[PDB]
Design a protein around this ligand. Structure first.
Ligand SMILES: Cc1cc(N)c2ccccc2[n+]1CCCCCCCCCC[n+]1c(C)cc(N)c2ccccc21
Lengths: 175, 186
């Protein structure tokens, strides 16, 4: 945990490659032997799992505010911009994909799961008629991740504005 | 020419060994130039890499001006541009030295300003697609500058975060997105 906490801080601030197990160990005393997650990957892939969940929990605690699935969608994407979980590691996560199908598969599904529920319960609630949810969930998720990640610099309220103009276009698109 | 040769050699070096690993001395010696001349044209490795990127955007835009003839309507151009963005990046060699470079100088605003200059140039492609689409009545976007930024960044996310998939599927999705997106505009 002293490892897992320092890593997150190092992976968020500096890169994936730019923070190595040398600097992580020196950051939390616990000697290199203690770091045995097997590889640097495993350490990192474990953090993503943690953070993806800390987000997914926060989303459940905050989705009550949404009455309809339409609102659930809008909101989920809005919250993605503001959260302190997962989405601030996406630079690392990108840098990770270049530098290297396993525990990754269980994450990518947990990552799209929030949209799966929304679109599934959305068909049950009759708000739209999407027939291939897995496609639309992976699309929506990644598009959103794009809007969050490829604008992390400019004014936060513009960001929120853009994401909502997105959510509108997308949902309107499905229906 | 020694500006171009520096750029060209630098590009290959970056492609070959990444951004961080490539030194200025390498670029210098391999291009039969000088640290002095490199400094006079680019000041830093960071800027040198930025001009490499400026060129690559210019080259990209040229591809698009030629490639977009295969797309008659702006609806078609939107579909295409997104495919290209996905496909052409899949085998883009600088893409790794870009990721490296970005996830390093994005906290620095002097650089990040110049990188948005670049990224805005990419967004411009969508701005044109949407604008001409308004003029042709393929759709009615009142807020084009926003919709462009969205399209571009939605496609970037699809391009970048899909990674765990087969390349024939990604195209399927990217086109599905292209479909869904356009069909929520009118
Ligand atoms: C040649 C060429 C070839 C292509 N297939 C191509 C495809 C799409 C766009 C440009 C292309 N170009 C042109 C490439 C010119 C360079 C401009 C793009 C770099 C600007 C930074 C973009 N960026 C931002 C904003 C935010 C991020 N978190 C981030 C993370 C990782 C990587 C990039 C990031």
């Amino acid at each position: 945990d002293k490892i897992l906490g320092v890593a997150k801080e190092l992976f968020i601030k500096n890169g994936y490659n730019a923070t190595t197990t040398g600097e992580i160990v020196k950051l939390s005393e616990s000697s290199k032997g203690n770091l045995y997650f097997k590889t640097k990957e495993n350490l990192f892939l474990e953090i993503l799992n943690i953070e993806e969940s800390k987000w997914q929990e926060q989303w459940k605690k905050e989705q009550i505010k949404a009455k309809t699935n339409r609102e659930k969608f809008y909101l989920y994407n809005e919250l993605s911009l503001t959260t302190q979980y997962y989405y601030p590691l996406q630079n690392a996560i990108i840098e990770f994909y270049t530098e290297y199908n396993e525990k990754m598969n269980k994450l990518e599904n947990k990552y799209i799961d929030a949209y799966h529920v929304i679109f599934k319960e959305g068909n049950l609630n009759g708000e739209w008629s999407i027939n291939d949810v897995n496609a639309v969930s992976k699309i929506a998720a990644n598009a959103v991740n794009g809007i969050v990640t490829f604008t992390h610099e400019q004014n936060i309220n513009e960001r929120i504005k853009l994401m909502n103009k997105f959510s509108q276009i997308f949902l309107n698109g499905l229906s």
